Amino acid sequence: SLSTEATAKIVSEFGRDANDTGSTEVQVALLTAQINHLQGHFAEHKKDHHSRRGLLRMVSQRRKLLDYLKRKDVARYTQLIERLGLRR
């Protein structure tokens, strides 16, 4: 997973109070950072199906989490997509 320093930096830069640690944007940023970091892992060890399922679970949670945010209020979801780089 992400290192403590990286997680703290992401939480500080994506949280309103820099101490939320669990808000929608913070969770999305953490999941995207983990997925991007594991993208380079799933190129030399393509047979790691015991971690590919975990990555798929993370992707599914992120998608359900983003859909909930979009349904609840489309005012930061559009900004979060542009700021983080997600296709949708």
Of the pair 58, 81, the CB lying nearest RNA is at 58
For residue 62, the minimal CB distance to RNA (Å) is: 10
For residue 79, the minimal CB distance to RNA (Å) is: 15
Binding site for RNA (CB under 7 A): 1-2, 4, 7-8, 11, 16, 19-24, 26-27, 30, 34, 37-38, 41, 45-55, 57-58, 61, 64-65, 68, 72
CA distance 88 to 32: 12
Residue-by-residue DSSP string for 37-81: HHHTTTTT-TT-HHHHHHHHHHHHHHHHHHHHHHHH-TTTHHHHH
